[PDB]
């Protein structure tokens, strides 16, 4: 279980990071000055797991 | 309908007319309730 959850969390965490840069390249460079708490969208790791 | 707030096998009984925001025990706030057995007499064959 630990070995497989390591891979699962590694895959599910880089998709969460990839979503953060997408909302920092476009959402705050053009349009507003945003905070980190708003752009996380925490329900990405949860649904994948 | 007559219900029963389930914290164990038996707790205080509540009925349907008690309207709340959702399903919950009025006395303790627990979120699981159970239907009671109606007092109709049941015939069971003893085989």
């Amino acid at each position: 279980a630990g070995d497989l959850f390591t891979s699962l969390f590694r895959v599910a965490f880089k998709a969460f990071v990839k979503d953060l840069v997408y909302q920092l390249e476009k959402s705050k460079v053009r349009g507003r000055r945003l905070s980190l708490t708003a752009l996380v969208r925490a329900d990405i790791i949860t649904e994948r797991i | 309908a007559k219900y029963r707030c389930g914290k164990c096998w038996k707790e205080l009984d509540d009925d349907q007319l008690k309207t709340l925001p959702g399903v919950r025990c009025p006395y303790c706030g627990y979120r699981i309730i159970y239907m009671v057995r109606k007092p109709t007499v049941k015939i069971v064959k003893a085989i």
Partner: protein, 66 residues
């Protein structure tokens, strides 16, 4: 769950001999001597008492509400 009323093989009543037998065996007596004193002579009726598991004691803590 609870002790059967009758032996499965023959129709002898065994449920009323469970409490004396179990009380005396956990008191340190020999099971064979207790069974012979109680009048349980056929091995069909002795397996009824020697293999019963009292599960209702555990189940009364998780009874369905209904």
């Amino acid at each position: 769950m609870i002790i059967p009323i009758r032996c499965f093989t023959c129709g002898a009543v065994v449920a009323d001999k469970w409490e004396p037998f179990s009380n005396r065996v956990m008191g340190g007596e020999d099971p064979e001597k207790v069974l012979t004193e109680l009048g349980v002579n056929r091995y069909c009726c002795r397996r009824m008492l020697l293999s019963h598991v009292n599960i209702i004691r555990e189940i009364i803590h998780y009874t369905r509400p209904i």
